[PDB]
Amino acid sequence: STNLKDVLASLIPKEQARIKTFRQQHGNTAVGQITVDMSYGGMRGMKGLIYETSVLDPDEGIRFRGFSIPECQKLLPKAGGGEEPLPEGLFWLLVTGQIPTPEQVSWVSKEWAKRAALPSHVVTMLDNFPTNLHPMSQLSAAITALNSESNFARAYAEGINRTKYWEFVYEDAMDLIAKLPCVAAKIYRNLYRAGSSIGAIDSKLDWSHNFTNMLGYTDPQFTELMRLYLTIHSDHEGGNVSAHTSHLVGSALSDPYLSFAAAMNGLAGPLHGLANQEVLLWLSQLQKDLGADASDEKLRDYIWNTLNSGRVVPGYGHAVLRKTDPRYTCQREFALKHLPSDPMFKLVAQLYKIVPNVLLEQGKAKNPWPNVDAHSGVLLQYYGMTEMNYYTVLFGVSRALGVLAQLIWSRALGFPLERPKSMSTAGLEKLSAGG
Amino acid sequence: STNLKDVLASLIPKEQARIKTFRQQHGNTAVGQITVDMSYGGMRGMKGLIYETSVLDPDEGIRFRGFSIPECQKLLPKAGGGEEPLPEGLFWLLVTGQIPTPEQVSWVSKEWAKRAALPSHVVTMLDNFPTNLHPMSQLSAAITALNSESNFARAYAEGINRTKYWEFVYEDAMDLIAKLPCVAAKIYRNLYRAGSSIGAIDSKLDWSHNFTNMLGYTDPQFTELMRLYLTIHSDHEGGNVSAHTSHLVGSALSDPYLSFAAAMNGLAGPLHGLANQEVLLWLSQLQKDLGADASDEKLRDYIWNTLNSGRVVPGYGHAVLRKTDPRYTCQREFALKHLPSDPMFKLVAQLYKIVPNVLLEQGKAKNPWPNVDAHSGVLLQYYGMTEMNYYTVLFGVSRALGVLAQLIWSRALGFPLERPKSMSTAGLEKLSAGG
Ligand SMILES: CC(C)(COP(=O)(O)OP(=O)(O)OC[C@H]1O[C@@H](n2cnc3c(N)ncnc32)[C@H](O)[C@@H]1OP(=O)(O)O)[C@@H](O)C(=O)NCCC(=O)NCCC[N+](=O)[O-]
Ligand SMILES: CC(C)(COP(=O)(O)OP(=O)(O)OC[C@H]1O[C@@H](n2cnc3c(N)ncnc32)[C@H](O)[C@@H]1OP(=O)(O)O)[C@@H](O)C(=O)NCCC(=O)NCCC[N+](=O)[O-]
Numbered sequence: 001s002t003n004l005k006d007v008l009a010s011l012i013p014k015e016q017a018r019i020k021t022f023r024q025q026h027g028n029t030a031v032g033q034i035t036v037d038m039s040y041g042g043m044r045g046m047k048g049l050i051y052e053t054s055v056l057d058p059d060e061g062i063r064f065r066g067f068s069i070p071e072c073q074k075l076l077p078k079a080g081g082g083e084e085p086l087p088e089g090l091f092w093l094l095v096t097g098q099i100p101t102p103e104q105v106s107w108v109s110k111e112w113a114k115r116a117a118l119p120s121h122v123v124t125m126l127d128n129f130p131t132n133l134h135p136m137s138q139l140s141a142a143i144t145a146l147n148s149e150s151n152f153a154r155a156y157a158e159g160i161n162r163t164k165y166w167e168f169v170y171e172d173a174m175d176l177i178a179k180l181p182c183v184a185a186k187i188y189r190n191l192y193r194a195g196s197s198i199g200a201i202d203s204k205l206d207w208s209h210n211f212t213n214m215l216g217y218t219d220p221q222f223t224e225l226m227r228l229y230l231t232i233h234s235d236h237e238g239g240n241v242s243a244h245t246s247h248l249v250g251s252a253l254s255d256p257y258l259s260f261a262a263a264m265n266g267l268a269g270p271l272h273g274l275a276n277q278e279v280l281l282w283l284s285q286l287q288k289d290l291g292a293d294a295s296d297e298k299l300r301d302y303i304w305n306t307l308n309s310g311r312v313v314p315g316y317g318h319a320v321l322r323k324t325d326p327r328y329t330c331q332r333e334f335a336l337k338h339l340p341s342d343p344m345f346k347l348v349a350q351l352y353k354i355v356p357n358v359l360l361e362q363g364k365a366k367n368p369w370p371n372v373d374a375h376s377g378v379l380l381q382y383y384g385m386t387e388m389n390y391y392t393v394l395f396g397v398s399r400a401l402g403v404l405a406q407l408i409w410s411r412a413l414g415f416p417l418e419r420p421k422s423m424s425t426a427g428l429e430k431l432s433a434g435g
Numbered sequence: 436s437t438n439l440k441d442v443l444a445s446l447i448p449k450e451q452a453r454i455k456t457f458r459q460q461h462g463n464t465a466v467g468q469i470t471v472d473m474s475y476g477g478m479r480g481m482k483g484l485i486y487e488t489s490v491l492d493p494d495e496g497i498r499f500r501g502f503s504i505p506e507c508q509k510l511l512p513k514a515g516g517g518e519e520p521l522p523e524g525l526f527w528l529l530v531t532g533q534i535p536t537p538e539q540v541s542w543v544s545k546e547w548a549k550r551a552a553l554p555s556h557v558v559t560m561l562d563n564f565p566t567n568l569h570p571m572s573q574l575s576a577a578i579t580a581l582n583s584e585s586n587f588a589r590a591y592a593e594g595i596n597r598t599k600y601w602e603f604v605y606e607d608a609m610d611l612i613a614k615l616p617c618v619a620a621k622i623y624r625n626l627y628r629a630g631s632s633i634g635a636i637d638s639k640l641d642w643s644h645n646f647t648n649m650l651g652y653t654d655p656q657f658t659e660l661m662r663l664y665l666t667i668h669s670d671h672e673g674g675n676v677s678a679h680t681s682h683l684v685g686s687a688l689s690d691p692y693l694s695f696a697a698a699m700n701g702l703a704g705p706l707h708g709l710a711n712q713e714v715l716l717w718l719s720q721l722q723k724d725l726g727a728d729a730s731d732e733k734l735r736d737y738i739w740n741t742l743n744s745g746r747v748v749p750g751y752g753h754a755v756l757r758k759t760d761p762r763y764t765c766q767r768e769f770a771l772k773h774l775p776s777d778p779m780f781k782l783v784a785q786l787y788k789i790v791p792n793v794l795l796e797q798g799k800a801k802n803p804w805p806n807v808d809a810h811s812g813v814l815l816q817y818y819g820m821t822e823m824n825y826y827t828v829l830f831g832v833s834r835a836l837g838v839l840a841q842l843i844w845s846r847a848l849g850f851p852l853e854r855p856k857s858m859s860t861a862g863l864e865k866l867s868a869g870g
Pocket of ligand 1: 044312313367
């Protein structure tokens, strides 16, 4: 009765027409300029991509198809007896642009349970990886290796007409989402629960719940945390490194598996998703040097040492946001409700009072406020997930939702190869006169 | 006596100063505008990046630090008794901006021989991969898995001051270049020469020569072809999918292994590097349908069928070039000298007379001329490398030279995170009025 694929089939042609006409009227309209400083500055401030699923406001934070986090929390379907939004529902919203019914949500849950299966070659590879190989590397290689299963890759090789790309992208996307938790959980078990098994998928549970069972966690509040985590880490517009990388690779017609694996390699960078892990490592050294209950002046000192040593303070700052990330606020509120007295949380809370002032004093950061990565690990640690090198894997799993939702649209809308023009310093100087 | 690392140590500070001053004077100078059509069109025509190593001219083709291909052919050091430029020399040029001496070239050759070694976990993974897993996927996963060895990753984790990033990038870059041929050759042997071994590196040979020996080819002309191939596939400015992907991932501080693997995933796309393989598959179906010696009218028909079926004609067209790719011309000239009567070459030559006219007649392609991918496989096939699904691996190996040369510079120059702003259609319409 419910079939997302049938819903998209109706939506596609209309969006195609609307963009066609808009472009007819305003294709040559200028929306901005490019300066020397923007080229040298990693395109900061350049409007360079169309990405439909979410849009980030520098002051207000992210909107998912027009809704803020508080709105989603409020509108999206929850688990029975639950309080946090189910990521399945967030997926529906991103893809269709409409708030799903609970019935629609349960269909997604079933679909993902049905498609969850790992090929033996992938199981083998994971089982043979050494324990010093970083979890994000293990994740990316496994996803790359899953491409033997790609339906898009297969149809392409068979000569499918370009107009049908979206259909095969959608299949691969739902298959990949389905398989992610099995990949991620097998890594977790092999690394940290050596000799145990992930077990099997229960077609009757929500995606987050099967995931936490495979991770081996029983706490019900942990399940709720996982639901919220996976929902809020989902998408963050198109120019962030992971999304942009998936977009750019997907534009060459690489299949969703290859596109998502490349994105993971970008998420593994210390300036991107790896910050969630870095925050915890920095806090551990903190508590270690200073010891649990530090004074304000000592925290300052410690922050300064980092800055003075030519390092960044993880979890603070943003390329676009200019105010406190609502994703951070959202986490804080969860902590205040569930683990108000945890000492680490307490430390994280104290840094909120300090860090921004030091960054401001330093005068370099454009945004001295915290970002999502500053509050995520702390929540995880409380529930027993102390393996900090694994944190980014959770972010990867969530991020699949948003990048794949857009990927289906990029192909539906016929977006071409992403290929800007580059310039050398010497050539740019000439273009101007030099300096 | 020769030490590239010492050469870079002197060059870095000067370039830093020159860019600093230029930016002081012209940072706010506008170099272009952004239109609606550019955002929807994968940034076509947008000047968006600084990339130092090579610059592409739409009419004249690529220049490597200011030199054209014919110039390189002429200036770069050759093998003893050789005619084609050694890629080692091309690497020196890209990195320093100066033409190396043969003595400098031999140092690179030795250095790469010395650093060539594979960790057992990587050997194991390759040996367990199934034969239906595409060679490019196998390559990317192995490179990702090599990241356990990253020196950059390690130094970062130790808190290295940002000013020294370049030094560790350079080490990883030389290590990765060194190891590429062993990875690539082991895949080749496992897939197509099952039961045999790649053997060992001869510290006395050039990089291309150790590579062809590991691939198992004895023909001396094959060695010369490999030298030229690896030289010309090296770099193609910064906005091409593979280079741009390495640049973007590297900008988040992911190590060179992760950055290069992500790039490979972009090179594996049918619209990018996979075209070299696609051309051969299309030619095989051609010769199969029509049979070896086709007439012009029949080739036309065959081209039309492709176009009419909603597919691209591989090997023709470009996002930036507007005339015949000099890399194509360069290949043709090699063919004319060495394999003038090969029937496939002959076919490729015939298509040159036909394809462009049909594309022009169709009126959609901006560039109806051939690109590099249209002529590369044919050369390979002649020498016995008939495994067309493997062709893109060779391109990956070459491409490492250029993207890694730039990567060292990106970190030396302190380029920040690549993070443009995205927009939804709805938001863009609002920005204007709509349409
Ligand atoms: C997010 C980030 C990369 C944004 O980069 P940009 O847009 O280039 O930041 P911005 O324009 O503020 O840079 C101005 C200067 O302040 C410096 N600065 C910015 N944020 C920080 C920070 N948290 N700690 C120290 N220095 C900083 C920045 O490195 C730059 O210095 P320099 O000119 O010497 O290169 C940067 O804020 C950062 O490195 N933050 C710390 C790492 C982090 O938390 N990453 C996670 C972000 C979220 N995610 O991606 O999952
Ligand atoms: C290289 C390529 C992606 C450039 O893309 P663009 O800059 O978007 O090309 P362009 O501006 O000419 O596109 C105009 C129209 O012509 C179409 N067109 C362009 N080249 C081709 C071609 N070779 N065969 C059929 N149609 C083509 C193109 O798809 C587009 O159609 P639509 O509007 O319906 O989307 C495109 O020429 C192509 O698909 N070529 C064939 C694949 C190929 O040879 N790739 C290898 C390139 C080199 N490399 O990357 O290693």
